[PDB]
Structure formats: structure tokens, C-alpha cells
């Protein structure tokens, strides 16, 4: 786990053989991570939309461990001010908002 | 409630005598709402930081009801692509991430 929101909900992830940190972001539809080298197929994707668009590489069905939970989901790889775990992967780990 | 994340976590809020909808956004530090007229004191605040800054009006200790929970917190008022309930108010309502 139960994570309070007094601080930014940053968690440890394992992806592409690397240990990283990312923000659990219920405001984000998608997961965007930088500085990861993933194997296998990708396609370009345009995201954002303010000031222009940002182009990222979309990798589908990527194995990823998030705070100890091994799941699978789409990971967008590209420049991001902060590594973000979006709703697409929070559903996979069974993460809910509770109050 | 327990809110799953398959869809955007949009909830009903009551603010400044108006009914509105806003996104529960654990990636946002602050709450930003547009098209609300709040009474009482404010000061300008610069937020964002990509491409420049956005100036908003900061109102402190604003009464707000979020999905039935009457709380108090800072509300930033200015044009925003989507109304956002940030961590500052999610803490007030006792909202946690759980998995």
C-alpha cells in the first residue's frame, strides 16, 4: 504494497536486464522509459501532442518486473523527463486507487 | 471506492459551487483545474517547465469535495488540457495505490 501519496510513488523496476526506477503515474495511459535497450521488434509511435509530438519506439509484450511483480506489457522507449509506469502496466500488476 | 485503472480514473468533484470532473493523477504533484471562480486570496505560480512555464493562480486551503470526500487543499487555477487532482489532494482523501 500500500503506497501513500505524500511523496512521489517511485518504484524499482527490472527491464531489459537493467535495474531502473520509475513513477507510478495514473495520469499516464502509457509506460515510457529512457535508456533501455530492448530486444525484438518495435515500431515508431508519436506521443504527447503539446508543442509538437515526441516520437518513441513502441515495443509490444515486453516482460517487466515492477516492484517485484513480473508482468508483460507495451513499453515505449524514448526521451522522457521522468521514467513513467502508465495505466497499461498498473493494470497488469493489479494496482488500484483506494480511498 | 476501489478504482481499477483500465480506464482513466476520472471522478466527480464539487469546487467553488460547481460540479466538475477531474483525473486522479498520481504523477502530478499539484491539483490544476480550469474554469473555476474561487473566492478569497491567490498568488501567481509558475508550473510546468517544458517549452516555458505556465502561470496559474494559487489558492490555498480551498474546500473541495472529491468523489464524496470533503477535504481542503491548494488548488491551482488555470487552463489545463485536463482537470487534474494531484497528490496534494489525494493525500487528503486518504487515497493510496494498492497491489
Amino acid at each position: 504494497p500500500q503506497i501513500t501519496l505524500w511523496q512521489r510513488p517511485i518504484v524499482t523496476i527490472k527491464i531489459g536486464g537493467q535495474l531502473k526506477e520509475a513513477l507510478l503515474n495514473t495520469g499516464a495511459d502509457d509506460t515510457v522509459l529512457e535508456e533501455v535497450n530492448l530486444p525484438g521488434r518495435w515500431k515508431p509511435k508519436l506521443i504527447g501532442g503539446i508543442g509538437g509530438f515526441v516520437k518513441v519506439r513502441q515495443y509490444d509484450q515486453v516482460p517487466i518486473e515492477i516492484c517485484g511483480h513480473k508482468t508483460i506489457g507495451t513499453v515505449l522507449v524514448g526521451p522522457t523527463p521522468t521514467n513513467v509506469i502508465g495505466r497499461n502496466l498498473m493494470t497488469q500488476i493489479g494496482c488500484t486507487l483506494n480511498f | 471506492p476501489q478504482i481499477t485503472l483500465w480506464q482513466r480514473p476520472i471522478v466527480t468533484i464539487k469546487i467553488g459551487g460547481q460540479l466538475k470532473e477531474a483525473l486522479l493523477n498520481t504523477g502530478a504533484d499539484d491539483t490544476v483545474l480550469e474554469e473555476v471562480n474561487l473566492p478569497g486570496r491567490w498568488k501567481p505560480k509558475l508550473i510546468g517547465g517544458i517549452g516555458g512555464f505556465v502561470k496559474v493562480r494559487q489558492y490555498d486551503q480551498v474546500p473541495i469535495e472529491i468523489c464524496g470526500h470533503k477535504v481542503i487543499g491548494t488548488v491551482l487555477v488555470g487552463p489545463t488540457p485536463t482537470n487534474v487532482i494531484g497528490r496534494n489532494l489525494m493525500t487528503q482523501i486518504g487515497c493510496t495505490l494498492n497491489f
Binding site: 495520469g27 499516464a28 509511435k45 506521443i47 513513467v84 | 502530478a28 487534474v84
Partner: peptide
Amino acid sequence: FNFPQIT
């Protein structure tokens, strides 16, 4: 920061 991300 502050982060509502739409494709």
C-alpha cells in the same frame, strides 16, 4: 512534476 499523458 505533473503528468497527464495521452498518446
